[PDB]
Amino acid sequence: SKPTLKEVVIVSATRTPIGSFLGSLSLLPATKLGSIAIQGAIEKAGIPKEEVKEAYMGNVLQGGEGQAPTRQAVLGAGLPISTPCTTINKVCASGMKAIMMASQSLMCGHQDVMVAGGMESMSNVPYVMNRGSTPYGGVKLEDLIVKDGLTDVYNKIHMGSCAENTAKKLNIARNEQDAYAINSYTRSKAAWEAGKFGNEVIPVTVTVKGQPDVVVKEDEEYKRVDFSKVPKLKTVFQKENGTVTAANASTLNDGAAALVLMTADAAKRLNVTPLARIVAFADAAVEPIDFPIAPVYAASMVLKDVGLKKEDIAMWEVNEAFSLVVLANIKMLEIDPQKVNINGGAVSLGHPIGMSGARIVGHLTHALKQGEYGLASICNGGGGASAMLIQKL
Amino acid sequence: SKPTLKEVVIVSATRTPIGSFLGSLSLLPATKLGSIAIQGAIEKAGIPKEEVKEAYMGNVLQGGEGQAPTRQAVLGAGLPISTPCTTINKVCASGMKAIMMASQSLMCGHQDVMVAGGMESMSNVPYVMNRGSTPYGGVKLEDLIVKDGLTDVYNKIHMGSCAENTAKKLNIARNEQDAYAINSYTRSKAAWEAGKFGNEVIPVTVTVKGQPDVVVKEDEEYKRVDFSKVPKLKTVFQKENGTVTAANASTLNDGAAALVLMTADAAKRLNVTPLARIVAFADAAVEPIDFPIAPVYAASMVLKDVGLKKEDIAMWEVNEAFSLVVLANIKMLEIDPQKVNINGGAVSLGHPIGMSGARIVGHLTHALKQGEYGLASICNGGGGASAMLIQKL
Amino acid sequence: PTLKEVVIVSATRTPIGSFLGSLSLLPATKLGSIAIQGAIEKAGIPKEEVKEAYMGNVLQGGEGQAPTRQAVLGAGLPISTPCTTINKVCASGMKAIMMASQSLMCGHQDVMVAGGMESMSNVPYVMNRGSTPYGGVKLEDLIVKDGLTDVYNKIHMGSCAENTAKKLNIARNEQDAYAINSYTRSKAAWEAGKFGNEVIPVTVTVKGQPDVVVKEDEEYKRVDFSKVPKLKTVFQKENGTVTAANASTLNDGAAALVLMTADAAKRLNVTPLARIVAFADAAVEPIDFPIAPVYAASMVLKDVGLKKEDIAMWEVNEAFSLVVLANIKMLEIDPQKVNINGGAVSLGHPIGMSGARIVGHLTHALKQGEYGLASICNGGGGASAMLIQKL
Amino acid sequence: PTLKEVVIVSATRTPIGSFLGSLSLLPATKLGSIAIQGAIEKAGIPKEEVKEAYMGNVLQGGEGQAPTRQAVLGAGLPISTPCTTINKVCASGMKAIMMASQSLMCGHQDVMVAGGMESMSNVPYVMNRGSTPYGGVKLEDLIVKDGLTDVYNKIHMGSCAENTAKKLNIARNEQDAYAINSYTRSKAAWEAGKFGNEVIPVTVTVKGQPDVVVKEDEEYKRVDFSKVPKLKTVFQKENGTVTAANASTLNDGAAALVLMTADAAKRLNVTPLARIVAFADAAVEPIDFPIAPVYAASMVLKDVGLKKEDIAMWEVNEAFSLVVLANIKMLEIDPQKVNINGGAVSLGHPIGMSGARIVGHLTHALKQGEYGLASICNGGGGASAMLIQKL
Ligand SMILES: CC(C)(COP(=O)(O)OP(=O)(O)OC[C@H]1O[C@@H](n2cnc3c(N)ncnc32)[C@H](O)[C@@H]1OP(=O)(O)O)[C@@H](O)C(=O)NCCC(=O)NCCS
Ligand SMILES: CC(C)(COP(=O)(O)OP(=O)(O)OC[C@H]1O[C@@H](n2cnc3c(N)ncnc32)[C@H](O)[C@@H]1OP(=O)(O)O)[C@@H](O)C(=O)NCCC(=O)NCCS
Ligand SMILES: CC(C)(COP(=O)(O)OP(=O)(O)OC[C@H]1O[C@@H](n2cnc3c(N)ncnc32)[C@H](O)[C@@H]1OP(=O)(O)O)[C@@H](O)C(=O)NCCC(=O)NCCS
Ligand SMILES: CC(C)(COP(=O)(O)OP(=O)(O)OC[C@H]1O[C@@H](n2cnc3c(N)ncnc32)[C@H](O)[C@@H]1OP(=O)(O)O)[C@@H](O)C(=O)NCCC(=O)NCCS
Ligand SMILES: [Cl-]
Ligand SMILES: [Cl-]
Ligand SMILES: [Cl-]
Ligand SMILES: [Cl-]
Ligand SMILES: [K+]
Ligand SMILES: [K+]
Ligand SMILES: [K+]
Ligand SMILES: [K+]
């Protein structure tokens, strides 16, 4: 027999703008961007801070951040000292997995109101030196972005080289990948200029003693592009017959996102209007080198579970880890390209890894029309993916 | 009314021995200790590896371990590439929180069989250097054990100094703390001598090319003691009227633990006999400085939830972060000290921070007699604690 | 065998670059090659005539094997040229000239190159060999550890200067006035074109960049006189005297001289600039290094029977303004004859280079028949001094 | 004035410690103090008579300001003693003695101390000044970067030796025979008490542990003759000849000599051990450093008018067994007169120390009236050589 569970709703979804690597938000640690997003979400939901019972935040690169990153973000947002906190790491899937795990606690009736999201400051990720005796001939200082973030343990190659493998297998060429990337930048600029993130993004003031304030109000990455340069660029992850470039891959970035989740009962009790219902979610895993196709199986599991067909989905958010990944998913699922990553994605907006899975779910929440279904999927290092289905209320 | 949930059972619980800092297990990465505990747990459960659907592992100090620590542990144990993995960080409570969150997935019917536990190799935790430019005059690279594991963010003091604060408030003196510590070493020795860890601990072979193999078959820490020296030690965190010493505090250590969890239905399908039922669990939080008393509130929450009295508990496992922590809990709960940490604990056995929360649940699993209730609780940095109630089958 | 007479035939230097400034892309050894090549060109002799080379260089860490050999081969000199790198802290550049002169005096060589080189911009940090200690690892800055810290007293060179300021009663306003005078004199000499024969320009070449020609000293323009009396006393909190403005700075540069016996100069028909008359080293209590040049200068004057009045120009290296004032006070010499075209407080102080630079400056600035005396202090309580006569 | 006669009055050294071994707790400067103090005691002169000091020291990074000054003051010599640190790579310790001899020959000092020191155990790693590059960086080992890599060829000293092994047809088996010979001679000489006047013991004090008295060289006992032919060729995978057993090792130690003019020895009632006759430096292509000592030795013989036959004993530094074999072959000398009591392959090679050690050894081992010739190669393609006669 199947358990009888509580219904879970999204009441608010807020994010910081995304900063470029060593760019506009580089002075702020990940936990502080977390505080900003969490306070933003609470404000937008219209509930007292004291109503939030527990918090989960995704965060992939936690080294040097200090004790209990999620607790820092939560206490920094002015939430009660009585609030338990857990920091989640499923690599790039962390921001989505946090929402999923929080949903499961709500479904069990173990809490009635929670905050879940993700945060990352890639600008502030440190280098490491090993503990022990210094070996004769040299001591390595490794970059934790490369070592913990972007290198497949098993193949000993960059995520970008794993992507090249799928480009080979599925015959997805340089020109197709470049066209997708240009498309992403185009959609991001359009959305931003049309005022489409007006309720999703909250601005950030950067203060430096002796300097005038800087107000960061929009995503930084999408303006850093030159369409004429795009087809000229070198293939950085493979010298012989490559396809992936700086322009058609996601970038390194800083940002945080937070959602307020509650049971249908609690939303009634607090007289708040729910934005969306969380219907179903799943995780899938494949051979580590094949992570780009893992979101295909995760999305399929979700559709099969709920009894829906791909054509029933109004809007897809397939995380733009690489242009290659989105094209692979479009090809295998046979879905309408006009319904995928409609207002841009990670290739042009950037990819603070622990945050992105939460951002894309928050974007569907705002963009879907009443009654429509949205499906968000995200690959992660090691061969995994997470996927989530929501319906707009 | 209340949700109707799947019943959750523990089928096996296994661990490596706990190694001392830079000691017998120091050559093995946390992820390798993870693979060993997971393999052991599946062997002891007597089920196909393919039946494990998903895995969660606690792990506090993830810097330099490589991409997706839990995935590394699971694949290194020979589990299917189809197995999704998430790495969990709630400081010292991590190993317990992993079991709790896995239990929640099982209750929702989202998976039927999971592995949960915790892993830490404090010997292999690195130092960090900031990204950017080196200041004129040099820099000190920070030790991540100290910066991420052991320093309160808000007070800017060691966990040990937070403990001194509780010692003051509740009048828990040096002599009482030293007596508790001696008692822990005594109880640990007694338990090993009596063969109380026979089914719980699996040995590990350390192989070094060009030297004989070393078989580690018991915990290393409890033999590193001198009872005569205990009352002579100086107080390491507070010179001015201190109480906490190297002897009466937990140590730095390496180890991993894993539990096979499934629904009661899955156990019947697979023809396995469960060891215990997971009944209830809870998280609590107080002011960061007051973490030593947080386990009191988490334990009370659990008892109230199920409607039991403290007298109903046959065995207590209150993690021995410091001798002070246990005495503080005994004092406030007003429970029988003969029922607390009966076979030793972290003061004498050691404290690989991400694993201890799982170890103590695993020990109750084996030590309890049929029908008895066991309660485990564990404090964590930032002011939190987790607690879990199980019943022997 | 009777001792041979030694002459200076040429003396050349790079401009001095500021810390992390205009010359920071070039290693010390490359600056040394440029200086050496320029000196040989000015001397008007084939490179093959140079028999052996000594270069001063204080902070050799990370420069690679045999720094002087790198400078020499980099300048296109023969593979047969033996090379030695000299370390007497700030006195290194002068000590190299002294030791080369001694080899020439013995008839062991007939033509040598000697000088000094330093790239403080490129001096690395160090980590100790061994087990990493619990709680953290220290990365020390070699400029501070090897260059600027007194071993015995465990204080900065600047704190040693404060000590002398106390004992000899040399005040903050006096040191500030001297520093302003140094900056003023440096600017005046550059504007008068007094370095036209001494300094050679350096071309800095970067990939995908337009070439940059560095033709003058960088440091002397980095000053605000109105701010001088307001600066904090960085080496001492209470009643301090030494500041960033009145102390020498950290810098990059190289200098080189072609030296010959009188017989070799004649054989090659070169016109020598100056004769080397005498030189000496003195040493005192480590903290008292500011006064060691007084004793070294005194030794050289006494050696040749000259009085302080017989000296036309003094170069007392400006380690700190305090040092020059202390020397003037103890020696009782005319300040208008001391560091007349500026010095290390305003031009900068690449430590292994400065003792060569000041001897090379005398060689160009002295008029025929005049005597010049150069002295320079060094960490540990030492000083070197040299007397030359213009030909 | 004519050139003064120079004599060696004493020569003393520490034992040589293995890499990270028995002397690894002591800095190079402390080892220097021990050797300098011993040399002065043995000379029987007041310490105030020593006027100036030069010490060889190749790897100066992290040792603190003015390494020679630290050694001198640590030995209890007066603060009035000027100090200079000398770097000619492996030739440093000899070149220091040569340069001191020139100062004495000129009449500039009458009594000096010269020698060399090195603590390879305490040589640090370096990190470049600047911003850390994306993707990380390896902190270089200064032993490798400054000590043992040829700048121009970008290969290890050991690979340079391979080049000479190929050119002169000196095979693996011949190199292994020479190395076993060195270990055998070292053990025999220690057992015969031949170092009793040369080596002074070192007490290593550690709080909470008993003292350790180091009384003999550590390295020569670390050998297994049956394993020598089984080792891998660590510098060259294909067709190699150089191994860990037949190469010098990395080590800690210091040596110091007291030098005087003949007049000074008379004045002080000192009976000197030997006279310094002549010395020279030679240089060739950097890759060809193994053969430079042939040319330096030939220069000294030619200068003085002696034949190779007139030399009673040769000390050709054992940088590699290959180097010694190449020198014997080109010079055509009796192998029974070469490195008679062992050398660097088995006693070890603290690089700034060895050039001084070998001159000190000849001073003790030669019989009255006999000539000894010492020679030593250095990175960059150099060598130094010196002739002495026993009195
Ligand atoms: C790809 C990556 C290594 C960056 O490469 P990079 O070479 O250091 O990037 P650069 O900025 O130096 O780009 C090099 C060139 O590309 C150009 N370029 C980059 N993006 C461009 C764009 N959008 N439009 C036009 N030109 C662009 C730059 O102008 C530069 O030009 P240049 O060669 O004349 O100097 C890094 O962003 C990365 O690793 N991305 C993948 C992140 C990832 O794996 N995420 C997780 C997914 S699972
Ligand atoms: C306390 C801590 C810093 C270790 O301190 P330390 O001073 O480096 O420990 P040491 O091994 O140097 O021991 C110090 C002295 O105590 C002695 N000692 C240690 N354990 C002993 C024992 N069990 N019995 C008798 N003597 C003991 C040692 O012999 C030593 O004596 P000495 O100085 O005369 O030689 C470290 O274990 C720690 O931080 N523990 C807390 C872990 C923690 O906070 N975990 C999180 C929980 S919230
Ligand atoms: C003194 C020393 C530590 C530099 O100190 P510093 O404080 O880091 O120097 P800075 O460049 O940051 O200068 C600090 C201030 O002084 C000012 N300043 C520096 N030189 C100045 C000048 N010539 N005129 C006016 N102002 C000046 C700067 O503008 C700055 O002002 P701010 O704090 O309002 O911005 C360094 O040059 C040194 O060690 N010198 C001695 C070298 C030495 O000892 N050599 C060996 C001799 S024995
Ligand atoms: C050669 C050098 C790199 C060390 O090599 P290494 O491989 O780290 O040396 P090791 O101590 O690890 O010895 C390797 C093996 O040789 C063996 N070995 C070494 N010396 C031996 C000897 N004298 N007899 C027998 N066996 C010996 C060791 O037992 C070891 O055996 P194993 O592989 O079974 O464990 C280093 O000593 C060096 O660079 N020397 C040259 C110094 C130099 O260039 N000086 C300047 C001259 S210009
Ligand atoms: Cl918490
Ligand atoms: Cl996964
Ligand atoms: Cl000196
Ligand atoms: Cl040379
Ligand atoms: K891009
Ligand atoms: K203990
Ligand atoms: K200045
Ligand atoms: K050897």
CSV table of C-alpha atoms in Angstrom, one decimal, chain D residues 217-336:
chain,number,residue,atom,x,y,z
D,217,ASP,CA,80.1,10.6,9.2
D,218,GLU,CA,76.6,9.0,8.9
D,219,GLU,CA,76.3,8.3,5.2
D,220,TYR,CA,79.0,5.7,4.5
D,221,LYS,CA,77.2,3.0,6.6
D,222,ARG,CA,74.1,3.4,4.4
D,223,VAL,CA,75.1,0.9,1.7
D,224,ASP,CA,74.4,-2.7,0.5
D,225,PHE,CA,77.0,-3.9,-2.0
D,226,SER,CA,74.8,-6.7,-3.3
D,227,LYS,CA,72.0,-4.2,-4.2
D,228,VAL,CA,74.3,-1.7,-6.0
D,229,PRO,CA,74.0,-3.5,-9.4
D,230,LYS,CA,70.2,-3.9,-9.0
D,231,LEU,CA,69.3,-0.2,-8.8
D,232,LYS,CA,67.4,1.8,-11.4
D,233,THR,CA,69.0,4.6,-13.4
D,234,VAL,CA,67.1,7.5,-11.8
D,235,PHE,CA,68.1,10.3,-14.2
D,236,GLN,CA,67.6,8.5,-17.6
D,237,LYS,CA,65.1,5.6,-18.2
D,238,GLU,CA,66.8,4.3,-21.4
D,239,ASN,CA,70.5,3.4,-21.6
D,240,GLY,CA,71.3,5.1,-18.2
D,241,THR,CA,74.3,4.7,-15.9
D,242,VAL,CA,73.8,7.0,-12.9
D,243,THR,CA,72.1,5.6,-9.8
D,244,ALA,CA,71.4,6.6,-6.2
D,245,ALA,CA,74.3,4.4,-5.1
D,246,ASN,CA,76.9,5.8,-7.6
D,247,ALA,CA,75.9,9.5,-7.2
D,248,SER,CA,76.6,11.8,-4.3
D,249,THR,CA,73.8,12.1,-1.7
D,250,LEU,CA,72.0,15.1,-0.1
D,251,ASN,CA,73.6,16.1,3.3
D,252,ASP,CA,74.3,18.5,6.2
D,253,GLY,CA,77.7,19.8,7.4
D,254,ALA,CA,80.3,22.6,7.7
D,255,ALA,CA,84.1,23.0,7.5
D,256,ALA,CA,86.4,25.9,8.4
D,257,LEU,CA,90.1,26.7,8.0
D,258,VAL,CA,92.3,29.3,9.7
D,259,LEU,CA,94.5,31.1,7.1
D,260,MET,CA,97.4,33.5,7.9
D,261,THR,CA,100.2,35.3,6.2
D,262,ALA,CA,103.7,33.7,6.9
D,263,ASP,CA,104.5,36.9,8.9
D,264,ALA,CA,101.4,36.5,11.0
D,265,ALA,CA,102.3,32.9,11.8
D,266,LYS,CA,105.8,33.9,12.9
D,267,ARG,CA,104.4,36.8,15.1
D,268,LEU,CA,102.0,34.5,16.9
D,269,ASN,CA,104.4,31.5,17.3
D,270,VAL,CA,102.2,29.3,15.1
D,271,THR,CA,103.5,26.2,13.3
D,272,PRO,CA,101.4,26.0,10.1
D,273,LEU,CA,100.2,22.8,8.6
D,274,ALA,CA,100.5,23.7,4.9
D,275,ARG,CA,101.2,26.5,2.3
D,276,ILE,CA,98.7,27.6,-0.3
D,277,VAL,CA,100.7,27.5,-3.6
D,278,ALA,CA,98.3,28.3,-6.4
D,279,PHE,CA,94.6,28.1,-7.4
D,280,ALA,CA,92.5,28.6,-10.5
D,281,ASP,CA,89.0,28.6,-12.0
D,282,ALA,CA,87.9,27.1,-15.4
D,283,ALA,CA,84.6,27.0,-17.2
D,284,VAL,CA,83.1,25.1,-20.2
D,285,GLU,CA,79.6,24.4,-21.7
D,286,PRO,CA,77.1,24.1,-18.8
D,287,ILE,CA,76.2,20.4,-19.7
D,288,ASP,CA,80.0,19.5,-19.6
D,289,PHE,CA,80.6,20.5,-15.9
D,290,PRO,CA,82.1,17.0,-15.2
D,291,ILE,CA,85.2,17.8,-17.3
D,292,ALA,CA,85.8,21.4,-16.0
D,293,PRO,CA,88.0,20.1,-13.1
D,294,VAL,CA,90.5,18.7,-15.7
D,295,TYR,CA,91.1,22.2,-17.1
D,296,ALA,CA,91.3,23.9,-13.7
D,297,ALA,CA,93.8,21.3,-12.4
D,298,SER,CA,95.9,21.7,-15.6
D,299,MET,CA,95.9,25.5,-15.2
D,300,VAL,CA,97.4,25.2,-11.7
D,301,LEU,CA,100.1,22.7,-12.7
D,302,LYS,CA,101.1,24.8,-15.6
D,303,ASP,CA,101.1,28.0,-13.5
D,304,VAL,CA,103.5,26.5,-10.9
D,305,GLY,CA,105.5,24.3,-13.3
D,306,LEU,CA,104.8,20.9,-11.8
D,307,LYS,CA,104.0,17.6,-13.6
D,308,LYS,CA,101.0,15.4,-12.6
D,309,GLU,CA,103.7,12.9,-11.3
D,310,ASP,CA,104.8,15.5,-8.6
D,311,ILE,CA,101.3,15.3,-6.9
D,312,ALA,CA,101.2,12.9,-4.0
D,313,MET,CA,97.5,13.0,-3.5
D,314,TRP,CA,94.4,14.2,-5.5
D,315,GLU,CA,91.0,15.2,-4.1
D,316,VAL,CA,88.6,15.3,-7.1
D,317,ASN,CA,85.2,15.9,-5.5
D,318,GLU,CA,82.9,13.0,-6.0
D,319,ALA,CA,79.8,14.8,-7.3
D,320,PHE,CA,79.1,11.5,-9.2
D,321,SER,CA,81.4,8.5,-9.6
D,322,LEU,CA,81.3,9.5,-13.4
D,323,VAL,CA,83.1,12.8,-12.6
D,324,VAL,CA,86.0,11.2,-10.9
D,325,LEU,CA,86.4,8.5,-13.6
D,326,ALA,CA,86.3,11.1,-16.4
D,327,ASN,CA,89.1,13.1,-14.6
D,328,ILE,CA,91.3,10.0,-14.1
D,329,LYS,CA,90.9,9.1,-17.8
D,330,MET,CA,91.6,12.6,-19.2
D,331,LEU,CA,94.5,13.3,-16.9
D,332,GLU,CA,95.9,9.8,-17.0
D,333,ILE,CA,96.7,9.6,-13.3
D,334,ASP,CA,97.3,6.7,-10.8
D,335,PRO,CA,93.9,5.8,-9.4
D,336,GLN,CA,95.6,4.8,-6.1
